[PDB]
Amino acid sequence: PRKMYSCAFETTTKVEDCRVWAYGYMNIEDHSEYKIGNSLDEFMAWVLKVQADLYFHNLKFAGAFIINWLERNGFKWSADGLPNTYNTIISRMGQWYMIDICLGYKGKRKIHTVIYDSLKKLPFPVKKIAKDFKLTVLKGDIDYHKERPVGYKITPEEYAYIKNDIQIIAEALLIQFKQGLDRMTAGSDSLKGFKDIITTKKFKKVFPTLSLGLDKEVRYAYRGGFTWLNDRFKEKEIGEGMVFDVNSLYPAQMYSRLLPYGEPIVFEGKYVWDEDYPLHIQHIRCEFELKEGYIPTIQIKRSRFYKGNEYLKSSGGEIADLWLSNVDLELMKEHYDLYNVEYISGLKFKATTGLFKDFIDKWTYIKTTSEGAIKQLAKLMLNSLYGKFASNPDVTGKVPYLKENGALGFRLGEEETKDPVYTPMGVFITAWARYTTITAAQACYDRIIYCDTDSIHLTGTEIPDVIKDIVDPKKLGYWAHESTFKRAKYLRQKTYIQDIYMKEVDGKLVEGSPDDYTDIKFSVKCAGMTDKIKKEVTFENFKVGFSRKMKPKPVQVPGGVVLVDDTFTIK
From-to residues of CATH 4.10.80.30 in the chain? 528-571
Cα separation, 265 vs 163, whole angstroms: 57
- CA dihedral (126, 131, 132, 136) positive or negative: positive
CATH superfamily of 392-421: DNA polymerase; domain 5 (4.10.80.20)
From-to residues of CATH 3.90.1600.10 in the chain? 185-257+422-527
Residues in a beta bridge with 522: 499
Binding-site members for Mg(2+) are 141, 165, 245-246, 452, 454
Binding-site members are 141, 165, 245-246, 250, 367, 379, 452, 454
Cα separation, 570 vs 496, whole angstroms: 11
C-beta separation of 286 from 341 below 8 A = yes
C-beta separation of 87 from 100 below 8 A = yes
The amino acid that residue 88 corresponds to is T
Binding-site members for 5-methyl-UTP are 250, 367, 379, 454
C-beta separation of 556 from 404 below 8 A = no
Query: What are the helix and strand counts (H, E) for the chain?
Result: 14, 25
C-beta separation of 122 from 171 below 8 A = no
Would you state the CATH architecture of domain 185-257+422-527? Answer: Alpha-Beta Complex (3.90)
DSSP-derived 3-state class of residue 371: coil
How is 443-509 classified by DSSP, letter by letter?
Answer: HTTTTEEEEESSEEEEESSSPPGGGGGGB-SSSTTSEEEEEEEEEEEEEETTEEEEEEEEEEETTEE
How is 146-194 classified by DSSP, letter by letter?
Answer: S---TTPPPPHHHHHHHHHHHHHHHHHHHHHHTTT--SSSHHHHHHHHH
- Tell me phi and psi for residue 326, to 5 degrees: -65, -25
Half-sphere CA count of 233, side-chain side, radius 13 A? 27
CB atoms within 10 A of CB 311: 16
Residue of 273, 281, 271 lying closest to 324 (CA atoms):
281
C-beta separation of 350 from 260 below 8 A = yes
C-beta separation of 487 from 497 below 8 A = no
Radius of gyration over alpha carbons of the chain, in Å?
A: 26
- Provide the angle, in degrees to the nearest 10, between the axes of the packed helices 249-256 and 372-383: 60
Cα separation, 252 vs 432, whole angstroms: 10
From-to residues of CATH 1.10.287.690 in the chain? 356-391
Distance of CA 221 to the CA centre of its chain: 20
C-beta separation of 350 from 453 below 8 A = no
CB atoms within 10 A of CB 304: 10
CATH 3.40.50.300 is held by the domain 258-355 = no
DSSP-derived 3-state class of residue 335: helix
| CATH class for the region spanning 356-391 | mainly alpha
DSSP-derived 3-state class of residue 223: coil
Distance of CA 507 to the CA centre of its chain: 33
Residues in a beta bridge with 556: none
C-beta separation of 430 from 222 below 8 A = yes
| CATH class for the region spanning 528-571 | few secondary structures
Cα separation, 127 vs 137, whole angstroms: 7
The amino acid that residue 65 corresponds to is F
Cα separation, 172 vs 167, whole angstroms: 9
From-to residues of CATH 3.30.1770.10 in the chain? 258-355
Q: Is 256 left (phi over 0), alpha (psi -120 to 50) or beta?
A: alpha
How is 74-128 classified by DSSP, letter by letter?
Answer: T-EE-TT--TTEEEEEE-TT--EEEEEEEEEEETTEEEEEEEEEGGGTS-S-HHH
From-to residues of CATH 3.30.420.10 in the chain? 1-184
DSSP-derived 3-state class of residue 344: strand
Q: How was this structure determined?
A: X-ray
Element (H, E) at 426: helix 423-443
Cα separation, 379 vs 363, whole angstroms: 8
C-beta separation of 27 from 39 below 8 A = no
CB atoms within 10 A of CB 322: 21
DSSP-derived 3-state class of residue 196: helix
What's the CA dihedral at 523, 524, 527, 528 to 10 degrees?
-120
Cα separation, 477 vs 436, whole angstroms: 9
Residue of 337, 341, 330, 343 lying closest to 288 (CA atoms):
337
DSSP-derived 3-state class of residue 31: strand
Cα separation, 128 vs 168, whole angstroms: 10
Q: What is the DSSP letter of 558?
A: T
Cα separation, 50 vs 45, whole angstroms: 9
Q: Is 534 left (phi over 0), alpha (psi -120 to 50) or beta?
A: alpha
Vertex 533, ends 531 and 536: CA angle to 5°? 115
Say if residue 417 is exposed, middle or buried (CB neighbours under 10 Å; 0-12, 13-18, 19+): exposed
Residue of 222, 219, 190, 188 lying closest to 430 (CA atoms):
222
Would you state the CATH architecture of domain 1-184? Answer: 2-Layer Sandwich (3.30)
From-to residues of CATH 4.10.80.20 in the chain? 392-421
Cα separation, 360 vs 248, whole angstroms: 11
C-beta separation of 258 from 330 below 8 A = no
Checking 143-146 for CB contacts under 8 A at 24+ apart, the result is: 144/13, 145/13
